[PDB]
Scaffold this motif. Structure first.
Motif, short mmCIF file in Angstrom:
data_model
loop_
_atom_site.label_atom_id
_atom_site.label_comp_id
_atom_site.label_asym_id
_atom_site.label_seq_id
_atom_site.Cartn_x
_atom_site.Cartn_y
_atom_site.Cartn_z
N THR A 28 0.85 -1.20 0.00
CA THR A 28 0.00 0.00 0.00
C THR A 28 0.88 1.25 0.00
N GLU A 29 0.27 2.40 -0.26
CA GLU A 29 0.95 3.70 -0.14
C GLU A 29 1.49 3.92 1.29
N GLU A 30 0.81 3.40 2.31
CA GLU A 30 1.23 3.49 3.71
C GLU A 30 2.40 2.54 4.04
N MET A 32 4.62 1.61 1.70
CA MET A 32 5.71 2.22 0.94
C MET A 32 6.24 3.49 1.61
N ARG A 33 5.36 4.30 2.22
CA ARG A 33 5.75 5.44 3.05
C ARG A 33 6.55 4.99 4.28
N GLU A 44 6.70 12.47 -3.75
CA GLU A 44 5.71 11.76 -4.57
C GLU A 44 5.80 10.24 -4.33
N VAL A 45 4.66 9.54 -4.38
CA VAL A 45 4.51 8.09 -4.13
C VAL A 45 3.42 7.52 -5.06
N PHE A 46 3.73 6.47 -5.83
CA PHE A 46 2.80 5.75 -6.71
C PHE A 46 3.04 4.23 -6.71
N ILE A 47 1.95 3.46 -6.80
CA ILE A 47 1.95 1.98 -6.93
C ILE A 47 0.84 1.59 -7.91
N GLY A 54 6.09 0.22 -8.70
CA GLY A 54 5.91 1.50 -8.02
C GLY A 54 7.07 2.47 -8.21
N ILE A 56 8.80 6.35 -6.32
CA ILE A 56 8.90 7.19 -5.12
C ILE A 56 10.03 8.22 -5.29
#
Length: 99
Positions: A28-30, A32-33, A44-47, A54, A56
């Motif tokens: 998830t974005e969380e 990956m964060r 920036e963050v994408f999956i 993904g 980042i």
């Protein structure tokens, strides 16, 4: 083709963008964060689950180099993560040289 750079160009934000491959289906974005929280919050963050990849983008080149050295080939959920710079080889330019 070749390697390195001709000198490029300076910009208001550095090209601190990392590509992340071999991602689990449970990311998830969380997650990956959190995986990058040792380097601070990303700009920036994408999956994308339909491709399995993904992206980042960090605040500095130093953070992106440390994150590359720390996370590449790292185990996650039984998978081995692929980490690389999303841009690295330079484009063409107009400048011949005589001798």
């Amino acid at each position: 083709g070749s390697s390195g750079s001709s000198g490029g160009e300076k910009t208001f934000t550095q090209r601190s963008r990392l590509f992340v491959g071999n991602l689990p289906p449970d990311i998830t974005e969380e997650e990956m964060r959190k995986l990058f929280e040792k380097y601070g919050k990303a700009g920036e963050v994408f999956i994308h689950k339909d491709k399995g990849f993904g992206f980042i983008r960090l605040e500095t080149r130093t953070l992106a180099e440390i994150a590359k050295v720390e996370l590449d080939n790292m185990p996650l959920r039984g998978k081995q993560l692929r980490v690389r710079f999303a841009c690295h080889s330079a484009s063409l330019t107009s400048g011949p040289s005589s001798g």
